[PDB]
Structures are given as structure tokens and as C-alpha cells.
Write a structure and sequence with these properties.
- This protein starts with 17 loop residues before the first helix and ends with a strand.
- It is globular.
- The longest helix has 31 residues.
- It has 15 helices and 10 strands.
- A 5-stranded mixed β-sheet has the order 1-2-8-5-3.
- Strand 6 and strand 7 form a beta hairpin.
- It has a single domain, classed as Cytochrome P450 (Cytochrome p450).
- It is an alpha+beta fold.
- Bound molecules: protoporphyrin IX containing FE (HEM) and the ligand Cc1cc(O)cc(C)c1C[C@@H]1NC(=O)[C@H](Cc2ccc(O)cc2)NC1=O.
- The ligand Cc1cc(O)cc(C)c1C[C@@H]1NC(=O)[C@H](Cc2ccc(O)cc2)NC1=O binds next to helix 11.
- The site of the ligand Cc1cc(O)cc(C)c1C[C@@H]1NC(=O)[C@H](Cc2ccc(O)cc2)NC1=O has 9 residues, from helix 11.
Length: 394
């Protein structure tokens, strides 16, 4: 006798378990047990993953309901699971979206200047360098302070909430509330601070005093700042870190992109496709009885959409483990999700990674791991897969 298959399968972000392809072939929707003890349906084919993500009857917001089967414990107030819906209901979606595009004047130059400064400092200090803690995460933090309009010197403290805020825990996390409440107070202070006139928080600060938004709550304005900083920084820092591993492990691709940087966008799109940064399937709660493949999912059941299931499905991406810069369907991966909840930061995340990689390959064309790959320490029970340190030489 064996227990019900447990998720997640592996916290390693440098390889997909052979188990994923066996599951997809034999049982592309199947029952699993999460870290809380709840049962859920794990969906691992491209066709069924897109079906779930394009049917709002599989609800994000309802995952927060009391009594629901849970993937993990909430680390935010339950109403914040519906953050984007709340922004939209408040009439703030176009303004938020506009503030977080990479198109703002000087943003790409800021990204390039910051990346080059971080890299020059690593070159001065000498090898080995830690490309997560001393490149990708500081580049993500600096980018999001600029996008939000808040001082660069406030980045580090907001960043240190994230090793707890994005935990994937069986139980509530006391520290998560301590840091959440503090970060909310910080963002409330920002809205009242007359120096803050640019970026997302500068715009929210103005809209808050506009009569057309007079009944939007102050809680929501502060919440948008905390959630967009946290989601953006953890997602871009973690994605760039694991993309750098995939690139370092492919010297032929590293050399090709170094020699022809015009291919970097197509490279980053493949690095997004094969990325293992999301540690768990995306959760949804059924609000009706719905057929998914051979399973009739019942109302109230938890469904987990395994992004690497979709993104390594050979029926959609032939030779899925290979980075191929000339695929016919290159952006059709699910790295940014799909449907109602498609990532609003997708363009910014692409540009963060493209500029970071462009800068690294110019400054460190001989970049290579400085330890055997198995020596990377993969963070556990977290919503992202990341190595604690990424030691490189060049
Ligand atoms: C490479 C970087 C990024 C990746 C891989 C990524 C990935 C994702 C994914 C897969 C989702 C869908 C979640 C779901 O459907 O359950 C999502 C949603 C979201 N992302 Fe991103 N993201 C990235 C960058 C960013 C950035 C830069 C921001 C903000 C600055 C951001 C903010 C959000 C928000 C607010 C949502 C929720 C949208 C909603 O519920 O409608 N992300 N992201
Ligand atoms: C768990 C968490 C902690 C935190 O301190 C801030 C946030 C935004 C989260 C949310 C968590 N992070 C994700 O990236 C995805 C996508 C998402 C992003 C933002 C959002 O507001 C709603 C959903 N899903 C999550 O549940």
C-alpha cells in the first residue's frame, strides 16, 4: 500500500522530473495530495491546462473561501487573493497597467544602467559572484522601486519580507502578518508623502484625491503597492535566476546570444517556456461540476494547473526540452498564465530578463557555474523554485 501521490514533486528548478511526462501521458488530470493534506486535481497537459485557465468557473478568488481544500495557507488577507478583481472594480486597472509597462521614458536605460553597475561591482570584487543575491534580485528590486516611484533605499527592507511572504506552507505564518502589516503601513505613508509623484504610487496618490475615486478605500491603494512590489520582484528575480542557470548550462546558446544579441528576445521566450520558477500548480476552485478530460470535477474541488506540464507537453511544443529559437508558436507557453488572470507584468518581466541577460553576456561572456550544478541549494516549501546562491565565474 502506498499513499496518494504528493505535490509538489521536486523543488529543483534545473531539471523537470521524468515523472511529469509519465503523468501527462497516462493521467493528464489526476488526484494528488497537497502539503495541507487536501486532495486536488493535478492537470498536466497543455490542452487541459488551457481549458481550466480559460474557464472562470474554475475560480481563483474562491480558493480563499473558508473551508476550501487548500494548496497552502494564505499569507495575505483573503480579500487580497482577488486583488486584480478589486483593482478592476475600483476603476484602476488601466492606470495600474500603464504604470507597469517597460515603455515609460528612461525605464529601459535605468534597467541597463543598473544591471551594468551591479555587474561592474561583481567584476571588481572578483570571482566567484552570486548571481541571485548580488545580481538578479537587486536588479528586480531596483526595477520595482523605479516602477513604483519609491526611493531605491527602501527596496532592501521591502525585499526582505519576500522569503516569508511567498512561502508555500501547510499552516498560517505569523511572520507573514507582521511583515504584511508593516509593509502596508509603509505604502500608506508613501501615498501621503508629497515627494512621491512618479511611478505607480505617484499615480495612485493622485487618483486617490481625484473625485472620481473618492470612495475607493485607502486599504486598496496601499495593498496595490505591496502586492505589485512583491509579485513583481519575486517573479522577475526568480525567473531571471533560473533562466541564467539554463543559459549557463548551454554554452552554445550563450555564445550564440552573445554574438547575435538581436536573438535575445526569442531566447528569453524559450527560457520562459522551459522555466520551472513556479513551484506549485496554479490553484483554482471549481464553482460547478465540469468535465476535464476523463474526470468530472465537482463543485468545491481544488484544481492545480501545472505550468511545466503544459510547457513541456510534446503535443504542443515538439522536442520540449530543447531551446529552439524558431518555433512556430513561441509565445503560446503558459509562463504568464492564461485567461482572466494572465500576468499584467508580462511585458515588464520580459524586458527585465532581456536587459539583464544582454548586460551579463556583454560583461561576462565566459560566465560559467563555479560549483557543480548539483551543489545548488533549492529553496523548499516556497511558491518559487530558486537556488539560495548562484555562484559563477567568468
Ligand atoms: C517573469 C516574470 C513573471 C512571471 C513568470 C509571472 C508569472 C505570473 C503568472 C503565471 C500569473 C498567473 C497566476 C494565476 O493565474 O494564478 C501571474 C499573475 C500576476 N502577476 Fe505575474 N509574473 C511575472 C512578473 C510580474 C510582474 C513584473 C508583476 C508586477 C509588477 C506581476 C504581477 C502579477 C499580478 C498582479 C498577477 C495577478 C493577476 C490576476 O490575478 O489577474 N508579475 N504572474
Ligand atoms: C502569496 C502572496 C504573498 C504576497 O505578499 C503578495 C502576493 C501578491 C501574493 C500572491 C501570490 N503571488 C503570485 O505571484 C500569484 C499571482 C498573484 C499575484 C498577485 C495577486 O495579487 C494575486 C495573484 N498568486 C498568488 O497567490
Amino acid at each position: 500500500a502506498t499513499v496518494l501521490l504528493e505535490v509538489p514533486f521536486s523543488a529543483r528548478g534545473d531539471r523537470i522530473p521524468d515523472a511529469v511526462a509519465e503523468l501527462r501521458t497516462r493521467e493528464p488530470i489526476r488526484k494528488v495530495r497537497t502539503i495541507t493534506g487536501a486532495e486536488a486535481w493535478l492537470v498536466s497537459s497543455y490542452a487541459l491546462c488551457t481549458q481550466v485557465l480559460e474557464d472562470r468557473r474554475f475560480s481563483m478568488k474562491e480558493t480563499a473561501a473558508a473551508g476550501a481544500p487548500r494548496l497552502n495557507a494564505l499569507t495575505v488577507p483573503p480579500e487580497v487573493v482577488n486583488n486584480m478583481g478589486n483593482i478592476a472594480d475600483a476603476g484602476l486597472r488601466k492606470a495600474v497597467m500603464k504604470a507597469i509597462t517597460p515603455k515609460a521614458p528612461g525605464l529601459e536605460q535605468f534597467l541597463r544602467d543598473t544591471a551594468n553597475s551591479l555587474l561592474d561591482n561583481l567584476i571588481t570584487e572578483g570571482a566567484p559572484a552570486d548571481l541571485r543575491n548580488d545580481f538578479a534580485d537587486p536588479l528586480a528590486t531596483a526595477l520595482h522601486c523605479k516602477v513604483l516611484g519609491i526611493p531605491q533605499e527602501d527596496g532592501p527592507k521591502l525585499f526582505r519580507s519576500l522569503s516569508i511572504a511567498f512561502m508555500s506552507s501547510a499552516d498560517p505564518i505569523p511572520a507573514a502578518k507582521i511583515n504584511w502589516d508593516r509593509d502596508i503601513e509603509y505604502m500608506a505613508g508613501i501615498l501621503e508623502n508629497p515627494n512621491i509623484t512618479t511611478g505607480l504610487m505617484g499615480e495612485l496618490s493622485r487618483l486617490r484625491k481625484d473625485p472620481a475615486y473618492s470612495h475607493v478605500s485607502d486599504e486598496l491603494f496601499a495593498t496595490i503597492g505591496v502586492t505589485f512590489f512583491g509579485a513583481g520582484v519575486i517573479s522577475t528575480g526568480s525567473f531571471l535566476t533560473t533562466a541564467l542557470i539554463s543559459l549557463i548550462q548551454r554554452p552554445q546558446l550563450r555564445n550564440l546570444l552573445h554574438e547575435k544579441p538581436e536573438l535575445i528576445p526569442a531566447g528569453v521566450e524559450e527560457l520562459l517556456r522551459i522555466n520551472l520558477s513556479f513551484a506549485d500548480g496554479l490553484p483554482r476552485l471549481a464553482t460547478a461540476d465540469i468535465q476535464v478530460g476523463d474526470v468530472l470535477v465537482r463543485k468545491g474541488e481544488l484544481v492545480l494547473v501545472l505550468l511545466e506540464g503544459a510547457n513541456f507537453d510534446p503535443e504542443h511544443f515538439p522536442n520540449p526540452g530543447s531551446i529552439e529559437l524558431d518555433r512556430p508558436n513561441p509565445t503560446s507557453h503558459l509562463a504568464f498564465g492564461r485567461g482572466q488572470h494572465f500576468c499584467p507584468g508580462s511585458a515588464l518581466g520580459r524586458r527585465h530578463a532581456q536587459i539583464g541577460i544582454e548586460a551579463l553576456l556583454k560583461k561576462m561572456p565566459g560566465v560559467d557555474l563555479a560549483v557543480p550544478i548539483d551543489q545548488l541549494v533549492w529553496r523548499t516549501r516556497f511558491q518559487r523554485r530558486i537556488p539560495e546562491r548562484l555562484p559563477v565565474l567568468w
